[PDB]
Structure formats: C-alpha cells, structure tokens
Amino acid sequence: ANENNLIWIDLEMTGLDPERDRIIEIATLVTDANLNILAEGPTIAVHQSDEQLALMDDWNVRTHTASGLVERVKASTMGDREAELATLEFLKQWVPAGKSPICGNSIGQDRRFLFKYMPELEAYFHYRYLDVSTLKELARRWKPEILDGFTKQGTHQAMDDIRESVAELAYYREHFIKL
C-alpha cells in the first residue's frame, strides 16, 4: 500500500437516480501517480431483484443486455454489501484509506450512488475528485482536433470503462498537457 497510488472506479446502474435506481456493476483498479495500472480490482455484477431490473428504461435495457450484464446480475450472489466488502479488501492492499481522490469520468454521478449504497467504500476515498472528463470538455472547446484522436467505445462495461478512462487521461497528458 502506498499513499501515492490512485483509486479508479466505475459503476453501472439501473438508472440515473440514486433514490430509485441501484448499482448493478462495479469495477476498480489502482494506478501509480503516472497512470501505470498496478492491479485490477474485482469486476462484480451486483445482484438486484428482477423487480428492480424491470424498472430500467429502454436505454438501460438495451445497454445492459447487450453487454450481458443483466444475465450476470440475475445470477450474481453478491449484493451491494458483499461487493463493497470485496472491493475494500482489494483496495486495502494498495492504497491507505482517505488518501486517494475518486478517479474516473463524470465521477460525481458514481459518487452519489456510493454515498447511498456503499458509504464505507465512499469514505475510503479522500474528499477530492479527479474527473478525467474535465480535460475532454476543455479540449472540446479549446482544441477540438485532439478529440478524434481518442475514441470511447461507450459499451458501459465497468472494467473496460475505467481502464479506458486511464488510457484517455494518458492520451490527454501527451496531447493536451504541457509538462
């Protein structure tokens, strides 16, 4: 465990509202300060009732069935707490509690779900945010040319998504950041 390591996380949910929707997939990984992936955390399909899944709208049904997540959710024997604990067991081996900001894309949305369903995991992060989307939004406005250089697949698969976020930040470090 090193206080300089960063915790990256991505979730998939049944919808956008924490009050009615639930977490259906979680993936985490740890990188050093230079974005080298040191280890992949568990990729867990979080079990939720069929009733909950039946509430998903068209976009969510199309998206989460195409990735095969829905089937994994129904067969999952790990609910929110079990997934939270498994993730914490992993993180404790690489990063001390309260040291790493939450790293990801449009990460504020994921954090809302962490606050409501996985508060212990949420508390493991430092207050700070490290949202890669900031660079994309700035480039979109100040240097659009580099936008076509990196393409997001938009498959909404937790582990592929978070690894993609790390690769995206690395891309901007080279093409948008002046070291």
First to last CA, the chain: 27
- Residue 63: Cβ within 10 Å count: 18
**Does 164 carry a binding-site annotation?**
no
**Does 12 carry a binding-site annotation?**
yes
**Which residues share a beta bridge with 28?**
9
* Whole-number Å distance between alpha carbons of 72 and 67: 10
93 binds, options its own copies, Zn ion, none, Cβ within 5 to 8 A by partner type: none
When the beta carbons of 2 and 109 are compared against Zn ion, the nearer one is: 109
Single residue of 50, 51, 77, 127 touching its own copies by CB under 8 A: 127
Residue showing the smallest CB distance to Zn ion in the complex: 161
Contact between 11 and its own copies (CB under 8 A)?
no
DSSP of 76-129: ----HHHHHHHHHHHHTTTS-TT-SPEEESSHHHHHHHHHHH-HHHHHHS-S-E
Look up 117 and say whether it is catalytic: no
Catalytic residue, chosen from 127, 129, 171, 172, is 127
Contact between 154 and its own copies (CB under 8 A)?
no
Catalytic annotation, residues: 127
Point out the annotated binding site for Zn(2+).
10, 12, 161
